[PDB]
Every structure is written in C-alpha cells, then in structure tokens.
Ligand binder design. Structure first.
Ligand SMILES: CCCCN(C)C(=O)c1c(F)cccc1OCC(=O)N[C@H](CO)Cc1ccccc1
Length: 554
C-alpha cells in the first residue's frame, strides 16, 4: 500500500519560519560563513512529501518467521507495568506541544484538573473504542544544516492528551522490552564508552571481521501495517494489566498503523499507512523492526556469525569474513533480503575490514591517548552539523538546545573540547548562567541539566580520560581542520587562547565553576592540575537507556 496519500492541502507552519543564520556577534565569533548555515522550513515540504510517498511491496519468508518467534519467546519473559496518570504526567516535557483541548504541557506537569480530567477521558476512550482513527498533526520540522539543500523532515504526532496515555500503557514496555528481546545488540542501553566497548569487543571477537552499516531509505515510510501489527504481537507477549492490553491493541489500530493527517491550519491533509515519527513506540518499534529484518536477512544471505547493533533505524552488522568476493556477494544477498522485507537501501552498503571506517549512529570509532600514552577508543563524527547548530542556537534563543547534548555525547573529541566547551562556557560565564539548568534535547528526549555538572556527567559517560586525551589520529585532525576552513571557524590556536581565558575566570570563581576550569580545560595549559575522580541522577539514563522521544527526565 501507499505510505501516504495527500488531498492537496498544504503542510503549513503555525508561525513565521527563519531559514537563514542571523548575523550576530556571538555566533560570528564561532562561525564566520553565515550564508552556509540554513534551517529547513515548510517551504521545502512538498519535495519531502514526494520522497516519502511510495508503494511498499513486502514479502515475508521462513527466516523472518523463525526470527520473529525467537524474539517473542524472549518478550514472553517480560512483565510490564501500567503507569498512573501522575507518573505519565511527570514524564511529560515542559515545552511539549500544548493540547488542542485547553491545556499545555505545564498544566500536565502541574497535575491541573483540566489536564488530568481530559487525559483520563482520553484513556477511557482508548479502552472503549478500538477503531476510530486518532487525529494527528503533520508539520515540517525545523532543522539546521550546512550547505553541500536538504528538504524539511515531516513530523507526525497526536494530541498531548493521547501522548500522556501512550506513556501510561507503554512507557514500561518501551523501556524494558527491547533489552529483553535483543540483549547486547540493543544499542540504546549503552552510554558512549559502553557502545565503544561493545563495538571494539565484538570486532575483536571475530577471527577475521567484516562489518557494514546499513542505511534504509526513509525508514519510517518503509514500515508497513504488517510490521506494526507484528511489533504489537511482541508487546502482547508481556504480562500486562487488562487495561494496558486494551490500550495497546486500540493504539495500534487507531494510531500506530496509520491514520489521518491534519495541517496546523486544521485542514485535512492526507492519510498515513506507515510509521508516525512522533509516537511513543517509534524508537522501540523501529529498533525491533530493524533488528528482526536484519537478523532474518543475515540467515538468508548466509553471512556468518553476524552480530547486530541496532538503534532505531540505525544498523551496523559485524560478522565473520568468508573471503572478499564471498563477502561482497553475501552482502548483496543481505540487501536483496532486506529489500523484500520492505527495508531497501539508501546508500548501497559496502563491506569494511577496519572498524574505524564504519559510520554508525552518525559516528565512527577513533583513537587517541591518555596522559600516560595508552590507547583510548572513543566516538566522533564530522563536526559540521554540530558546529552549524551551535552557531544557530547561539544567535537564536532556543528554550530547548542541542549543543549541550552534543558536548555530552562527544566530550572526548578534539572539536567538542576546544571549540564547543570554550565557546559556550565563555558566553555562559559572561552572562552569569553557568548554573542555570538547560532543557537539553538528546535525540527526541528531554533532560534538564546545569552546565556546571558537565564534569561529573562526562566522567561517568566516558571516563576520566576524556579530560586528558591528546595525540588524536591524523584522519581525525584532518577532518576537523577542513571543516573549520569550510565554515569560517577561527583556527584552533584562537580556541586555545579563548579557553585559557575562560579557564582563568572559571578558576577565580571557585566552587563548581573551578571544577569546570580544572577538568574541562586542562588540555589548554602546561602546568596541569591534578586530575582525580570527582567526589548522581544517572538512573533516568542508565536503567532503561533511551527509550524514545517526548520523554522528560530530571
Ligand atoms: C539516556 C540518553 C542520554 C544519555 N546519553 C547521552 C547516553 O549516551 C546514554 C547513557 F548515558 C546511558 C544509557 C544510554 C544512553 O544513550 C543511548 C544511546 O544510544 N547513546 C549513544 C551512545 O551509546 C549516543 C551517541 C551516539 C553516537 C556517538 C556518540 C554518542
């Protein structure tokens, strides 16, 4: 069937859209070539609609059915909890889209009567009505990139009231089931240093390893009604409260498998028969679907000892080599199988025989050395997009931000350390906001974090070596260097000069600021200070990992 059908009504914005990087002193100190940085808008939405709209031809086979039953046998060990309205409300992001029913995310969080009464009514409706399609809004998402232009991504989400009900029925499921089903291959359970450990150990565990990332084109659109019902069949193997079982069955038929699209102006926009980007089960569902399809395709292709690492639609496979011609051919057979499964490639996959050449989760493993000269593996990526976004959020007030999560994810990197930390710490210090908690977007989720806690966070997510790395690899330095010339970012000597200046200010204030000076900026001085383990709340991160978007943790 068609992933989408359209009536001709437009994908509308509900406010003016900015597509150019403003000319502003603070962002200009970071990046000079402002004309290279752009934000997507609803003006490119029709181009995206064309790409995401197509017919899906799915053909399932014995390997798929075998793998599906192996997954269900493991899902069968799961016992899941129904969340109370209060628990689901506290998981609601503060700046989450308001309901069209007279209340907003803050009213939800405060347990206001209007909000709670309405959420309760929505829940009872899920229990009563198993068929009426649930309305969704379609919007063009505003995302920032560097030229060489991407059309806007389209986001699909239901009303606030429904989102809170999804958490009630399925939060515990999305947070515990993927690990029970996929074990070590479930990527979202890992901190960055633990993802590196698994990739390095899996690689080292093969006699002759071969690995590849697999890019599925427009994954959400490739997701069929069958996939979504199969996904539900895995959820139904959990021990569930009667009302959760019903709310899952109703959400699946009324929301998950598809439904009507309304634009911001309230106009009937079209119809969806594929994955909605903005529902609770998107991340877990995509992960389970991508894992099932890949696991079965490996058997079909006869790849050997194929270890998966799956994070939503992001896939990396590491296996035993059968020789070079054999590998090329088996990988083409793997692609042919995924294609029948309705998971066709975007960029053709290629076999790799070096772990550092594989890009997965938009990152690659690289190597540096700690103060004692020992090798430390860590994740990095091309810094273009992170720098373009840091510049945009510097010039444009963003009640939400992406730069802080970037520093946390990429802390051991040369670029996050010399540029990002230096830049944002200089500014927050001048503005007396080092201590101000920020609402940090990490993938689709939300975390409240004070910049002053960065050292403790980094030491846990990456180890104390993140503050001592040096001797980065030539390829990494090469890549960083070329991006700075391309974006007009001042050279590293200038960032060193800035860091020394902010480091001295951080030290002079003492307290938590001085801890930031000592750990975050020790790379910038000779007279290194003693780096000992720093004398919290990492549970919301560690117990379930990243369980999906529109989730808030404090
Ligand atoms: C819990 C969500 C926020 C806490 N962060 C930031 C995490 O990492 C994280 C964590 F600390 C504990 C548990 C799970 C976590 O994350 C899930 C996940 O898939 N993370 C990956 C790394 O494995 C992010 C990443 C991908 C590529 C390159 C660099 C970093």
């Amino acid at each position: 069937s068609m992933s989408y059908t359209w009536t001709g009504a437009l994908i509308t914005p509900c406010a003016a859209e900015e597509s150019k990087l403003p000319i502003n002193p603070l962002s200009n100190s970071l990046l000079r070539h402002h004309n290279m940085v752009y934000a997507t808008t609803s003006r490119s939405a029709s181009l995206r609609q064309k790409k995401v709209t197509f017919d899906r031809l799915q053909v399932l086979d014995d390997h798929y059915r075998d793998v599906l039953k192996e997954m269900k046998a493991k899902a069968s060990t799961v016992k899941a909890k129904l969340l109370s309205i209060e628990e689901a409300c506290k998981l609601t992001p503060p700046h989450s889209a308001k309901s069209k029913f007279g209340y907003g995310a803050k009213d939800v969080r405060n347990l206001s009567s209007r909000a709670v009464n309405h959420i309760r009514s929505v829940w009872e409706d899920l229990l009563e009505d198993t068929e009426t399609p649930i309305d969704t809004t379609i919007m063009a998402k505003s995302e920032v990139f560097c030229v060489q232009r991407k059309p806007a991504r389209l986001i699909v989400f239901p009303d606030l009231g429904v989102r809170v009900c999804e958490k009630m029925a399925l939060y515990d499921v999305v947070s515990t089931l993927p690990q029970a089903v996929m074990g070590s291959s479930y990527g979202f359970q890992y901190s960055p240093k633990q993802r590196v450990e698994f990739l390095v150990n899996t690689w080292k565990s093969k006699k002759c390893p071969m690995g590849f990332s697999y890019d599925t084109r427009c994954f959400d659109s490739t997701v069929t009604e069958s996939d979504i019902r199969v996904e539900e069949s895995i959820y139904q193997c959990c021990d569930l409260a009667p009302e959760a079982r019903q709310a899952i069955r109703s959400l699946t038929e009324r929301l998950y498998i598809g439904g009507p699209l309304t634009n911001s102006k309230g106009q009937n926009c079209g119809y969806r028969r594929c994955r909605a980007s903005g529902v609770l089960t998107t991340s877990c569902g995509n992960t389970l679907t991508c894992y099932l399809k890949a696991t079965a395709a490996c058997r079909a292709a006869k790849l050997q000892d194929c270890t998966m690492l799956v994070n939503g639609d992001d896939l990396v496979v590491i296996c035993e080599s059968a020789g070079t011609q054999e590998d090329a051919a088996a990988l083409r057979a793997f692609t042919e199988a995924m294609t029948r499964y309705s998971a066709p490639p975007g960029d053709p996959p290629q076999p790799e025989y070096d772990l550092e050449l594989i890009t997965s989760c938009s990152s690659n493993v690289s190597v540096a050395h700690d103060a004692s000269g020992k090798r430390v593996y860590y994740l990095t990526r091309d810094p273009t997009t992170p720098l373009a976004r840091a510049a945009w959020e510097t010039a444009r007030h963003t009640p939400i931000n992406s730069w802080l999560g970037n520093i946390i994810m990429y802390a051991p990197t040369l670029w996050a350390r010399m540029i990002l930390m230096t830049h944002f710490f200089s500014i927050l210090l001048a503005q007396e906001q080092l201590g101000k908690a920020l609402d940090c977007q990490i993938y689709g989720a939300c975390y409240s974090i004070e910049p002053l806690d960065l050292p403790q966070i980094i030491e846990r997510l990456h180890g104390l070596s993140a503050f001592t790395l040096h001797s980065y690899s030539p390829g990494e330095i090469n890549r960083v260097a070329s991006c700075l010339r391309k974006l007009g970012v001042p050279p590293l000597r200038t960032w060193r000069h800035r860091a020394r200046s902010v480091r001295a200010k951080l030290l002079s204030q003492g307290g938590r600021a001085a801890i930031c000076g000592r750990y975050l900026f020790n790379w910038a001085v000779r007279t290194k200070l003693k780096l000992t383990p720093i004398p919290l709340d990492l549970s919301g991160w560690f117990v379930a990992g990243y369980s999906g978007g529109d989730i808030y943790h404090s």
